[PDB]
Write an enzyme that holds these catalytic residues in place. Structure first.
Site, PDB file in Angstrom:
ATOM      1  N   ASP A 130       1.071  -1.163   0.049  1.00  0.00           N
ATOM      2  CA  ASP A 130      -0.378   0.150  -0.033  1.00  0.00           C
ATOM      3  C   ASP A 130       0.373   1.252  -0.403  1.00  0.00           C
ATOM      4  O   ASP A 130       0.766   2.756   0.427  1.00  0.00           O
ATOM      5  CB  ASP A 130      -0.776  -0.038   1.217  1.00  0.00           C
ATOM      6  CG  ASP A 130      -2.157   0.739   1.001  1.00  0.00           C
ATOM      7  OD1 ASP A 130      -1.984   0.847  -0.207  1.00  0.00           O
ATOM      8  OD2 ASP A 130      -2.986   1.078   1.983  1.00  0.00           O
ATOM      9  N   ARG A 134      -0.804   9.209   0.570  1.00  0.00           N
ATOM     10  CA  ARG A 134      -1.300   9.380   1.707  1.00  0.00           C
ATOM     11  C   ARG A 134      -0.900   8.266   2.711  1.00  0.00           C
ATOM     12  O   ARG A 134      -1.515   8.520   3.931  1.00  0.00           O
ATOM     13  CB  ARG A 134      -2.455   8.856   1.362  1.00  0.00           C
ATOM     14  CG  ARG A 134      -3.172   7.434   0.617  1.00  0.00           C
ATOM     15  CD  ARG A 134      -3.992   7.045   0.324  1.00  0.00           C
ATOM     16  NE  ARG A 134      -4.348   5.179   0.203  1.00  0.00           N
ATOM     17  CZ  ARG A 134      -4.089   4.556  -0.223  1.00  0.00           C
ATOM     18  NH1 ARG A 134      -3.652   5.126  -1.587  1.00  0.00           N
ATOM     19  NH2 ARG A 134      -3.800   3.104  -0.359  1.00  0.00           N
ATOM     20  N   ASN A 135      -0.061   7.337   2.251  1.00  0.00           N
ATOM     21  CA  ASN A 135       0.323   6.674   3.391  1.00  0.00           C
ATOM     22  C   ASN A 135       1.380   7.084   3.778  1.00  0.00           C
ATOM     23  O   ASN A 135       2.422   6.187   4.254  1.00  0.00           O
ATOM     24  CB  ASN A 135       0.159   4.947   3.441  1.00  0.00           C
ATOM     25  CG  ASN A 135      -1.003   5.055   2.502  1.00  0.00           C
ATOM     26  OD1 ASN A 135      -2.056   5.583   3.383  1.00  0.00           O
ATOM     27  ND2 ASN A 135      -1.298   3.672   2.009  1.00  0.00           N
ATOM     28  N   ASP A 148       2.213   3.171  10.344  1.00  0.00           N
ATOM     29  CA  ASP A 148       0.938   2.196  10.078  1.00  0.00           C
ATOM     30  C   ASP A 148       0.316   1.287   8.835  1.00  0.00           C
ATOM     31  O   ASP A 148      -0.404   1.752   8.009  1.00  0.00           O
ATOM     32  CB  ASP A 148      -0.785   3.621  10.649  1.00  0.00           C
ATOM     33  CG  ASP A 148      -0.250   4.426   9.608  1.00  0.00           C
ATOM     34  OD1 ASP A 148      -0.396   4.564   8.111  1.00  0.00           O
ATOM     35  OD2 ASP A 148      -0.601   5.973  10.248  1.00  0.00           O
TER      36      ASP A 148
END
Length: 251
Positions: A130, A134-135, A148
């Site tokens: 992922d 945005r991460n 996270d």
């Protein structure tokens, strides 16, 4: 010893949520450090507490300057996980807000720093699955970190077609993340239906060369997007190439 005394934590304002409860910013004091405090609303339920704390057991296995660190836990109810705080928040938003103030050297630095974190994960044979702006989190204007840890517009074709996630699919995703960074947080395939994305990839459409992108940076991105995963670079090469490219831009 990861156990922290509750009296050394001052709960501040709510900054987000996770599956188990609200996430707060706060302070870690001693005879003061800004931290993130993950809470677990139903931690009196043993099975919920166990699953929540597994996130802390996972993160303590990583020790890298560009991966968010576990600071400690409070395992008496209410159970808290204390994490490093990245005070400037999500990278995608930061890029969008600060686009007219961020120079190319900063954008390349973010890519470089992420490649070091991902080379570290690769060394542990850990597949992220992922990788996207945005991460990524912003610790400082000169420091980003992974924290996270379907996003169709970021995924490798073998992930979309066959649900396969590997070191090579992570490299594809990192290529897309690099493009996002150079484009100041513009979304890949903006305005495109998720279902049409795989068609574009299989017709050899790739994300375009961003303005001001060094030529060798864009051909590197292009290698990350080789259809055959065996033709994509690994993160050791990506890190080395990005270091050279960064040095070139700074000088």
């Amino acid at each position: 010893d990861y156990e922290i005394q509750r009296e050394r934590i001052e709960l501040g304002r709510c900054i987000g949520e996770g599956q188990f409860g609200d996430v707060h910013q706060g302070i870690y004091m001693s005879p003061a450090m800004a931290v993130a405090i993950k809470t677990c609303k139903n931690c009196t339920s043993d099975s919920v507490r166990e699953k929540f704390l597994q996130e802390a057991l996972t993160m303590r296995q990583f020790d890298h300057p560009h991966i968010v660190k576990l600071i400690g836990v409070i395992t008496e109810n209410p159970v808290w996980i204390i994490m490093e705080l990245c005070t400037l928040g999500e990278l995608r938003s930061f890029l969008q807000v600060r686009k007219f103030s961020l120079d190319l050297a900063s954008l390349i630095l973010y890519a470089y720093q992420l490649s070091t974190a991902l080379a570290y994960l690769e060394s542990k044979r850990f597949v992220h699955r992922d990788i996207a702006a945005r991460n990524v989190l912003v610790s400082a204007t000169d420091c980003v970190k992974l924290g996270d840890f379907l996003p169709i517009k970021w995924m490798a074709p073998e992930s979309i077609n066959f649900r396969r996630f590997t070191s090579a699919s992570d490299v594809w995703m990192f290529g897309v993340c690099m493009w996002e960074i150079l484009m100041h947080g513009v979304k890949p395939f903006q305005g495109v239906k998720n279902n049409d994305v795989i068609g574009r990839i299989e017709n050899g459409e790739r994300l375009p060369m961003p303005p001001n992108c060094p030529p060798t940076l864009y051909s590197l991105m292009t290698k990350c997007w080789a259809y055959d995963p065996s033709r994509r670079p690994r993160f050791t090469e990506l890190k080395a190439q990005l270091s050279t490219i960064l040095e070139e831009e700074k000088l």
